[PDB]
């Protein structure tokens, strides 16, 4: 699982 | 920007 809010 | 990989 990978989540990124950049 | 938003990246999501379940």
Numbering used by the authors:
A (entry chain B), B (entry chain A): 1 to 6
Question: What did the paper state?
Answer:
We determine nine polymorphic crystal structures of the APR segments of glucagon-like peptides 1 and 2, and exendin and its derivatives. We propose that the pH-dependent changes of the protonation states of glutamate/aspartate residues of APRs initiate switching between the amyloid and the folded, monomeric forms of the hormones.
Aromatic side chains form a cluster in which acetonitrile or ethanol is also present, while TFA forms multiple H-bonds with termini and Trp side chains. As the concentration of EtOH was reduced from 30% to 10% in the crystallization solution (keeping all the other parameters identical), the entire cross-β scaffold rearranged from parallel to antiparallel relative orientation. On the other hand, nearly identical polymorphic structures were obtained from the crystals grown in 10% EtOH and 30% ACN (polymorph A vs. C). In polymorphs A and C of APRTc5b, an acetonitrile/ethanol solvent molecule is incorporated in the aromatic cluster, leading to somewhat larger ring-to-ring distances as compared to those of APRex-4.
